[PDB]
Amino acid sequence: LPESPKRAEEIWQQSVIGDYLARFKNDRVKALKAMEMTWNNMEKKEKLMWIKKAAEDQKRYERELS
Numbered sequence: 001l002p003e004s005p006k007r008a009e010e011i012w013q014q015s016v017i018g019d020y021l022a023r024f025k026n027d028r029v030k031a032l033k034a035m036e037m038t039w040n041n042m043e044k045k046e047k048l049m050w051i052k053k054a055a056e057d058q059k060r061y062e063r064e065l066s
Contacts, residue, residue: 002064005057008050009039 006014013035020031039047 002061005061006054008047008054011053011057012039012047012050 016035016038017031020034021028024031024034
């Protein structure tokens with residue numbers, strides 16, 4: 001029953017989705033496109049906090065399995 005571990009990009013997406021949806025007046029394909037473009041353009045230094053969160057969620061998954 002434990003949820004699968006979340007990738008760095010997914011954790012970041014969760015943090016910003018409300019804002020992109022409000023921007024694009026709830027055009028969901030466009031909000032998702034915009035987020036895809038943004039993540040793809042982000043430098044490693046900007047992705048690092050999300051990489052860390054993804055590493056911790058792998059540990060969360062492992063705890064929950066045991």
